[PDB]
A paper describes a structure:
DAAO (D-amino acid oxidase) is a flavoprotein with exquisite stereospecificity for catalysing the oxidation and, hence, degradation of D-amino acids. Using FAD as cofactor, DAAO binds to D-amino acids and, via a hydride transfer mechanism, oxidizes the amino acid and, in the process, reduces the FAD cofactor. The DAAO active-site lid (amino acids 216–228) had previously been hypothesized to open up to allow for substrate access. Thus, the structures reported here are revealing in that, by capturing hDAAO in a lid-open conformation, they provide direct evidence which confirms past hypotheses of lid flexibility.
Residue numbers in the entry:
A (entry chain A): 1 to 218, 223 to 298, 302 to 337
B (entry chain B): 1 to 25, 29 to 58, 62 to 219, 222 to 296, 303 to 337
C-alpha cells in the first residue's frame, strides 16, 4: 500500500503520523512518502505561535469542538513528560480583552481555570473594560513539525521536495492513496474558491520577562502578544484575499504600535524576526474521501484557517479513520 | 548631615534611596559594605512576591511593597528593575486557610480539580497572579540610581558602630542582613541557609511553590527573566557558605518530580545564601550618634523591602525634627 502525503505542515505531518500509527502493522508494507515544496521552517505552520484557543465565533459545530477538545486533551497529556520541550509544548496563562461584555466561550471548560477578569486586573489595561483569564497551552509550530519529522523519520517515512502539479501525476506513479494537506494552496490542485488566504504578519521579539499571553478583540485586526519558548510573538493582522508574501511596513507599524500601547515594556524589546503567512481560510474544513479515475483515492484535509494547531489532532485521527474505511473497501 | 548606610543588599540600598528621595531637600550619604552585587544574599533570591503563610505592621509593609511594584510593572524602567508579572501555583497536601495577602495579589482563587490532576502528590491549593523583582537587576538599578544622586560606595568591612561614629557619621543605618550580630549581639538572629540552582528552562511560564507542614524544604520552581530558579532548602542555624551535594540532589529530584520537563534543562549555576531569620524584623531606633536598625527580613526581604524602606524613612525624619 503506497501512500503519498502532499504537505509537510502541521496537517500533513500529523495525518501521516496517525496513519502509520494505526495501520503500519496491518499492511505489508505500509509505504509512506511525504511530498512538499515547502518544509519547516518555510511552512505557514512555522509562522504560528501555537496558542490553543478556538476563534470567538462559535460555529455551533460539535464535531469541530470535539476535534478541538481531542487535540487539547492530547497535548495536555504530553505537557508533563520528558518529551515536551521537544514538541515545543508548554502551559501558559493570560488575558482576553474586550471593550464590551460578551458571553462565556464554549471551550471555557476545556481550558484550565477559566474566569472573568477582576476590576484590578482590568485596571492594567486602560483601553479595555471586560475580559477573561485562563490557562491553556502553546504548541510552537516550528518545534512541533521538527518533532513530528523525527518521529516520522524513525518510522521509515521518506521526505521529498516536490511541487505537485496534479493528483494524476502522483497517481500515475503508483500512489494508492493521496492525502491532500496542501493548506491555503489546495486550490492549485483542484478548483476551490471557498479557500482564501487570510494573510497574516507577525514579529518575534526578545522579551523574556513576558510570561502571559494577551489577546485583544474588536473583525481580526487587534493586537496580540504571545510568549513562546525563546521569543515573543507580536501580531494582530488579518487580510482576507491578500496573497502578498512580503512584510508590509504599514502592518509592521500597526503590530508594533498596537502592541506597545498594550504593553509599553515592549518598546525596548529587540526585534529578532518578522514573517508573513497565509491562513488557509475556508468557511469549513475540507476533510473527506474522493475517488479519482486512474485505483486511487484522495483524502482532503485542508482549510483550517487560523486554528490549525488548535484542531489538528482531531482532524488527523479523522483522516486516519477515512484511510481505514478505504482499507475495509479495497 | 552625614549618614552611613551599612549594607548593600536590597535592604541597605532601598533604605538609602528612599531616605535620599524623601529628605535631600542636605544629606551626605555613604554606603559601606564588604559585599556588593552579585555576591549578596539578595542576589540569590528569585524575587517572588509572597509573604510567608504564618500571619503585625509587616503585612502592610508587604502590601505597600506589592502596590508600589505593581504600579511600575509597565514603566520604562521595569526591565532594568528586573520586574514583571507572573502567575502560578501553591500546592498543599490538605486544605489550609486563604492567606492574609489574598486580595493584595491579582485573581486569587482555589485550584480546580482538573488543575490538581496535573500534580499527583497534592490535593489542594491556590492560583494567583503576583510579581517578580529579580535581586541582581534590582540591586544594579538601585546602585545606578544612588550613584546619580551622589551616594558614594566603599568596599569596607565595618568593625563597630563607634568606629563609624568617630568618623563623624551623624546617623548609621544598619542594614547588615544576617551578620548584624557581629556588630551588636542579637540572640534572636539566625541564618536560614538556602541553596538554589538556576537552569535554562524558558518554556516554564508559571511559578510552582509546594508546602510540607518539613518546614520549608519543599520544592519550588520560579521562572526569572533569563533562567529558572529551582529550590526548596531552609536550614535554620547552618552557616556553611558552600553548595552541598545532598542539597543539590534534594532540589533537583524534588523539582524534576514536580516538573519532569526539567530533565532536559541545562544547569547554569548553583548558589547558597543566608536568610536573616528573626521572630520579627528589627526596624527601629537606638542612640549610642543615632542608629536605625533594619535587619532580620528572613525569606521575604524582596517581598517587604519598600514598606521597610518607608518606615525607616519616617524614623529618619523624626531624628531630623529632633536636631
Ligand atoms: C500569523 C499567523 C498566526 C497563526 N497562529 C496560530 C495559532 O496560534 N494557533 C493555530 O492553531 N493556528 C495559527 N495559525 C494558523 C495555522 O498557521 C494554520 O491553520 C496551519 O498552519 C495550517 O497548516 P497546513 O499544514 O494546512 O498548512 P501549511 O503549514 O501551510 O502546509 C502546507 C503544506 O502544503 C505544501 N504544498 C502545498 N501545495 C503543494 C503542491 N502543489 N505540491 C507540493 N506541496 C504543496 C506546502 O509546501 C506545505 O508543506 C496562524 C497563522 C498565521 C498566518
Ligand atoms: C535561597 C533564597 C531564596 C530567596 N528567595 C526570596 C524571594 O523569592 N523573595 C523574597 O522576598 N526573599 C527571598 N529571599 C530572602 C531575601 O534574599 C533576604 O530577605 C534579603 O536578601 C535580605 O536582604 P539584606 O539586604 O537584609 O541582606 P543581604 O542581601 O545579605 O545584604 C547584607 C549586606 O550587609 C553587608 N554587611 C554585613 N555586615 C557588614 C559589615 N560589618 N561591614 C560591611 N558590610 C556588612 C553585606 O556585605 C551585604 O552587603 C531568599 C533568600 C534565600 C537565601
Ligand atoms: O477570534 C479570534 C481572533 C483572533 C485574532 C485576533 C486578532 C488578529 C488575529 C486573530 C485570535 C487569535 C489567537 C491567537 C493565536 C492565533 C493568532 C492568529 O493570528 C491566528 O490566526 N490564530 N491563532 C487565538 O488563539 C484566537 C483568536 O480568536
Ligand atoms: O511560607 C513560605 C515558605 C516558602 C518556602 C518554601 C520552601 C523553602 C523556602 C521557603 C515560601 C517560598 C516562596 C517563594 C519565594 C521565596 C523562596 C524562598 O526560598 C524564600 O526564602 N522566600 N521566598 C514564597 O513566595 C513564599 C513562601 O512562603
Ligand atoms: K492531585
Amino acid at each position: 500500500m503506497r501512500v503519498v502525503v502532499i504537505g509537510a505542515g502541521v496537517i500533513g505531518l500529523s495525518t501521516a503520523l496517525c496513519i502509520h500509527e494505526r495501520y503500519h502493522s496491518v499492511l505489508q508494507p505500509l509505504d509512506i512518502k511525504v511530498y512538499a515544496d515547502r518544509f519547516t521552517p518555510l511552512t505557514t505552520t512555522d509562522v504560528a505561535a501555537g496558542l490553543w484557543q478556538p476563534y470567538l465565533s462559535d460555529p455551533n459545530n460539535p464535531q469541530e469542538a470535539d476535534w478541538s477538545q481531542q487535540t487539547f486533551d492530547y497535548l495536555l497529556s504530553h505537557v508533563h513528560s520528558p518529551n515536551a520541550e521537544n514538541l515545543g509544548l508548554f502551559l501558559i496563562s493570560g488575558y482576553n480583552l474586550f471593550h464590551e461584555a460578551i458571553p462565556d466561550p464554549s471551550w471555557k471548560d476545556t481550558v484550565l481555570g477559566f474566569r472573568k477578569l477582576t476590576p484590578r486586573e482590568l485596571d492594567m489595561f486602560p483601553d479595555y473594560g471586560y475580559g477573561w483569564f485562563h490557562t491553556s497551552l502553546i504548541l510552537e509550530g516550528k518545534n512541533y513539525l521538527q518533532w513530528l519529522t523525527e518521529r516520522l523519520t524513525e518510522r521509515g517515512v521518506k521526505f521529498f521536495q516536490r511541487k505537485v502539479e496534479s493528483f494524476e501525476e502522483v497517481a500515475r506513479e503508483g500512489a494508492d492513496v493521496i492525502v491532500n494537506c496542501t493548506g491555503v494552496w489546495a486550490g492549485a490542485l483542484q478548483r476551490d474558491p471557498l479557500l482564501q488566504p487570510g494573510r497574516g504578519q507577525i514579529m518575534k521579539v526578545d522579551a523574556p520577562w513576558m510570561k502571559h499571553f494577551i489577546l485583544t478583540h474588536d473583525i481580526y485586526n487587534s493586537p496580540y502578544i504571545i510568549p513562546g519558548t525563546q521569543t515573543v510573538t507580536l501580531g494582530g493582522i488579518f487580510q482576507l484575499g491578500n496573497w502578498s508574501e512580503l512584510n508590509n511596513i504599514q502592518d509592521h507599524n500597526t503590530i508594533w504600535e498596537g502592541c506597545c500601547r498594550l504593553e509599553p515594556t515592549l518598546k525596548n524589546a529587540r526585534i529578532i524576526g518578522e514573517r508573513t503567512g497565509f491562513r488557509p481560510v475556508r468557511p469549513q474544513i475540507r476533510l473527506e474521501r474522493e475517488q479519482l479515475r486512474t485505483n486511487t483515492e484522495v483524502i482532503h484535509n485542508y482549510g483550517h484557517g487560523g486554528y490549525g494547531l488548535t484542531i489538528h489532532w482531531g482532524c488527523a485521527l479523522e483522516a486516519a479513520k477515512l484511510f481505514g474505511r478505504i482499507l475495509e473497501e479495497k
